[PDB]
From Swiss-Prot, chain A:
Gene name of this polypeptide: S
Protein function: Subunit of the fusion protein that is processed upon entry into the host cell. Mediates fusion of the virion and cellular membranes by functioning as a class I viral fusion protein. Contains a viral fusion peptide that is unmasked after S2 cleavage. This cleavage can occur at the cell membrane by host TMPRSS2 or during endocytosis by host CSTL. In either case, this triggers an extensive and irreversible conformational change that leads to fusion of the viral envelope with the cellular cytoplasmic membrane, releasing viral genomic RNA into the host cell cytoplasm.
Protein source organism: Severe acute respiratory syndrome coronavirus 2
Protein name: Spike protein S2'
Interval of the full protein contained in this chain: 884 to 932 of 1273
Length: 49, 49, 115, 49
């Protein structure tokens, strides 16, 4: 769901679409993520590993 | 008849969300809510000789 | 922070999206009344990340793309209000060959019918 | 504030620009994993107002 389950009913949304929402909240446009999705996923997996 | 029973407590009800990579849910109508909160600020001033 | 302004911290001035707060006094204490906003009456839609016009990819400026089965609209995120996709609520970046899930539609240009 | 939402307070949910946070449990305690965003590979330019 994201942050929608802490202020009411839970609403579903795809994870790559939510990552763009969270990218917009720091000042970076959302077209940056959609054109670097695989690299970001690889970095996240390597960092959590 | 009435009696006293003992059991193991439960935590809640299952709310599995319908997740796909192509579906989103958007609310359509709203409510206004008012809640209350209570806080102590001070106590009594006493003196003993 | 709750009475003299509007707060963005989660679950600080009540549960929900903060709107207002009012104070009252009690013997040796204070009472706060928090007024918030709650959504309701959800629905179902199909979504896409971008729309590929002729050789170009269009991204939504402030909303999100939705569909009702046959036609596509762009709406705001916290309330359902569909509008026809135009060149004044989307921006172009690149071509439709790198994004995963890009779909086809048409984008209306509000200048040609004028002349 | 870090798990149920996205924070703007500096150095609250980690060092950097906050993206996400995940909880885990430990004996008599909790553990938070903070996922942030860091810039890199700067350059040089001339600016005008
Ligand atoms: C969003 O939610 C509000 C309530 O939270 C909805 O307002 C309510 O709408 C119903 C249906 O029109 C109203 O019921 C009516 O009651 C009278 C009897 O008083 C009856 O004669 C009518 O036939 C009808 O059933 C209800 O009064 C009304 N509530 C308030 C406070 O005005 C609103 O409709 C919702 N929005 C949408 C788009 O559904
Ligand atoms: C999805 O929404 C569109 C909105 O355009 C619906 O199409 C319109 O339906 C009305 C009512 O039948 C017609 O008067 C319009 O002429 C239709 N629009 C066009 C461009 O022809 C469509 O019916 C909706 N689909 C569903 C499944 O509800
Ligand atoms: C949503 O998930 C489905 C299922 O994984 C994806 O459907 C497949 O997409 C690939 C192309 O990437 C096709 O080769 C397959 O034939 C599809 N499977 C079907 C139709 O059963 C779909 O692409 C995903 N959508 C997005 C936007 O990633
Ligand atoms: C969106 O439309 C374009 C063009 O109408 C499609 O691109 C063509 O795709 C077919 C098969 O998919 C190819 O044989 C053509 O060579 C493509 N044309 C060009 C100019 O590259 C595209 O496939 C459509 N989108 C989807 C999802 O099918
Ligand atoms: C919403 O998802 C699909 C798409 O319309 C529908 O079949 C389903 O019944 C709806 N509700 C839920 C809970 O998935
Ligand atoms: C950036 O500043 C000038 C302008 O290009 C350049 O000469 C210099 O080497 C660059 N790096 C630093 C650290 O100043």
């Amino acid at each position: 769901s994201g942050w929608t389950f802490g202020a009411g009913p839970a609403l579903q949304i795809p994870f790559p679409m939510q990552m763009a929402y969270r990218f917009n909240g720091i000042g970076v446009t959302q077209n940056v993520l959609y054109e670097n999705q695989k690299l970001i996923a690889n970095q996240f997996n390597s960092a959590i590993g | 008849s009435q009696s006293i029973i003992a059991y193991t407590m439960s935590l809640g009800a299952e709310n599995s969300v319908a997740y796909s990579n192509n579906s989103i849910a958007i609310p359509t109508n709203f409510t206004i809510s008012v809640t209350t909160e209570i806080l102590p600020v001070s106590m009594t001033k006493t003196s003993v000789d | 922070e709750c009475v003299l302004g509007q707060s963005k911290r989660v679950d600080f001035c009540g549960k929900g999206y903060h709107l207002m707060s009012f104070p009252q006094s009690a013997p040796h204490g204070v009472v706060f009344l928090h007024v918030t906003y709650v959504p309701a009456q959800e629905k179902n839609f199909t979504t896409a990340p971008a729309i590929c016009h002729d050789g170009k990819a269009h991204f939504p400026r402030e909303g999100v793309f939705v569909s009702n089965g046959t036609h596509w609209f762009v709406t705001q995120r916290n309330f359902y209000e569909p509008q026809i996709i135009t060149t004044d609520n989307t921006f172009v970046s690149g071509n439709c060959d790198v994004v995963i899930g890009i779909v086809n539609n048409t984008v209306y240009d509000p200048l040609q019918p004028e002349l």
